[PDB]
């Protein structure tokens, strides 16, 4: 009953409890905004915007790209790339997702 993560704003399919990567990081951006981030190995239904940036990266050795909900454009988090073990992952804002049945 709690296996799929969807965008809270529009219901787009985003990820699965199975795809969590151990999981929960509380971070601040330079504007002091707090994000409660869940790391996922895999996500779908996003639109990755721009080219990667290392600036203010929360994760040592990773560059980030903005991940929008590909349906409604709501900011769901970031895709991280350029690191090692693992090379890539997603950091999604927990309170911008909804959890429910398959």
Ligand X SMILES: O=C1CC[C@@H](N2CCCc3ccccc32)C(=O)N1
Residues contributing to the annotated binding site for Ca(2+): 24
The footprint of Zn ion (CB under 5 A) covers 7, 9-10, 12, 69, 71-72, 74
Among 13, 41, 57, 71, binds ligand X (CB under 6 A): 57
Task: Give the number of C-alpha atoms closer than 13 A to the C-alpha of residue 87, restricted to the C-beta side.
Answer: 0
Separation of alpha carbons 91 and 42, rounded Å: 10
What phi and psi, each to the nearest 5 degrees, are found at residue 18?
-55, -30
The burial of 94, by beta-carbon neighbours within 10 Å (0-12 exposed, 13-18 middle, 19 or more buried), is given as middle
Instruction: Give binding residues as ranges.
Output: 7, 10, 24, 69, 72
* Min CB(45)–Zn ion separation in Å: 8
On the question of a cis peptide bond just before residue 86, with omega within 30 degrees of 0, the verdict is yes
* Min CB(40)–ligand X separation in Å: 15
Q: Which of residues 76-95 bind ligand X (CB under 6 A)?
A: 78
Positions touching ligand X (CB under 6 A) are 29-30, 56-58, 64, 78
């Amino acid at each position: 009953g709690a296996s799929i993560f969807r965008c809270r704003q529009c219901g787009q399919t985003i990820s699965r409890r199975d795809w969590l990567l151990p999981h929960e990081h509380v971070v601040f951006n330079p504007a002091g905004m707090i994000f409660r981030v869940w790391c996922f190995s895999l996500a779908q239904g996003l639109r990755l915007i721009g080219a990667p940036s290392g600036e203010f990266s929360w994760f040592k050795g990773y560059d980030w790209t903005i991940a929008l909900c590909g349906q409604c454009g709501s900011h769901l988090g970031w895709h991280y790339e350029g690191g090692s073990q693992p090379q890539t992952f997603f950091g999604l804002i927990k309170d911008r997702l909804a959890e429910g049945p398959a």
